[PDB]
């Protein structure tokens, strides 16, 4: 036990700015031997966590001075001096003063960057998929910012809402933009019955929706 709580849960910050992540404990973290075993890790997507700071303010080999830990007893703080795109991920705090060692929930740090409109692309079903009886028509909305975007499928001007799957991408570590795939799947027959397949995206960077279609 001993619950570690972090605040904030999501922390947006523009490049070059400072970022502060707070972790507080449900009990004092000062061991009877005088050490405070509070630690901070950074978990990047599809990777195990890596240590940044241990025992409140000591850096692990390699970790740059942008990162600094402070705190005492129950309140601890991770500060980042100049956020860089390479810094995005989920920061966790941990304590090993008390058994069982316990972790916090996470503070997903996300970069604030200039607005970007998505670049839509639509692809009709392949011959290969078609010969198997099904037909997925896919649409990619790549490299946009902010993550808020709405996609609409229209089959011959008629809106399609069932059978569509949408997947997002975490903020891209290279340019802080987001991406998304919308996939309308139908049978060969439903597909062969219609003509125009449209992918419409409403994103704030445009008053008028970005549309993309192909006629069969």
């Amino acid at each position: 036990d001993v619950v570690m709580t972090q605040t904030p849960l999501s922390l947006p910050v523009s490049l070059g700015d400072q970022a502060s992540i707070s972790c507080r404990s449900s009990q004092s973290l000062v061991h009877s031997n005088g050490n405070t075993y509070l630690h901070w890790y950074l978990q990047k997507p599809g990777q195990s966590p890596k240590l940044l700071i241990y025992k409140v303010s000591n850096r692990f080999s390699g970790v740059p001075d942008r990162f600094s830990g402070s705190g005492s007893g129950t309140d601890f703080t991770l500060k980042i001096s100049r956020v860089e795109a390479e810094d995005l991920g989920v920061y966790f705090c941990s304590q090993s003063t008390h058994v069982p060692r316990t972790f916090g929930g996470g503070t997903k740090l996300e970069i604030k960057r200039a607005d970007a409109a998505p670049t839509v692309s639509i692809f009709p079903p392949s011959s290969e998929q078609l010969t198997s009886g099904g037909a997925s028509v896919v649409c990619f909305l790549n490299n946009f910012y902010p993550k808020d975007i709405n996609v609409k499928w229209k089959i011959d001007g008629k809106e399609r809402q069932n059978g569509v799957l949408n997947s997002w991408t975490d903020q891209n570590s290279k340019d802080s933009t987001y991406s998304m795939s919308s996939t309308l799947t139908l049978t060969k027959d439903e597909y062969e019955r219609h003509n125009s397949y449209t992918c419409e995206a409403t994103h704030k960077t445009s008053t008028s929706p970005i549309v993309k279609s192909f006629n069969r």
Partner: protein, 204 residues
């Protein structure tokens, strides 16, 4: 340097027991405690135990059973759907912190099923976006590369969604217009559960 060699994935039917290993190398095993942590997709991180004088977390009292010795194993017991998470082994001693790659343990009665890979070709522009559609696979864990992985600069891999009991996912890549179809790009999809590896050439 310290290397903690762990299995990549494991699929087991609910109710069975599974024993995950962690091959320690690069250091004298005998000097540091071997820890274990569980992480469920939804971020959360939980400690399970250390070790052959084992010290456990009380919640995982009757689920784990640590053994050792070159290796340290963790045996989980009476698996449920809740038991599907990433399990790591680690040396968490202060300035000495090393984590294994993790072993994804999918607990399911489902049957492994290989992916169907369809190419997605479009036209005009200063660059062209192509992609592949990987559908029908189980369990997750599929890797999609472009040109044996030599094309990485503009690759967006989209998370796997669960459509009708089987996973689906797409990957996209954007190359300059003058290079396609002048040069072919091909996407490689590897589903290890079924020992599948299929390439798909991107033709107009």
């Amino acid at each position: 340097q310290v290397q903690l060699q762990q299995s990549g994935a494991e699929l087991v039917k609910p109710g069975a027991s599974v024993k995950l290993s962690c091959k320690a190398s690069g250091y004298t095993f005998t000097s540091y405690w071997m820890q274990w942590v569980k992480q469920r997709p939804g971020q959360g991180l939980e400690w399970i135990g250390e070790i052959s004088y084992t010290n456990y977390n009380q919640k995982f009292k009757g689920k784990a059973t640590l053994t050792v010795d070159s290796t340290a194993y963790m045996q989980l017991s009476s698996l449920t759907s809740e038991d599907s998470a990433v399990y790591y082994c680690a040396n968490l001693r202060g300035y000495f912190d090393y984590w294994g790659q993790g072993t994804t343990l999918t607990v399911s009665s489902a049957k492994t099923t290989p992916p169907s890979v369809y190419p997605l070709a479009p036209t005009t522009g200063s660059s062209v976006t192509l992609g592949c559609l990987v559908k029908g696979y189980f369990p997750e864990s599929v890797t999609v590369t472009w040109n044996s992985g030599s094309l990485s600069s503009s690759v967006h891999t989209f998370p796997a969604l669960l459509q009708s009991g089987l996973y689906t996912m797409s990957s996209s890549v954007t190359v300059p217009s003058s290079t396609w179809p002048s040069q072919t790009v091909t996407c490689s999809v590897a589903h290890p559960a079924s020992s599948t590896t299929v390439d798909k050439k991107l033709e107009p």
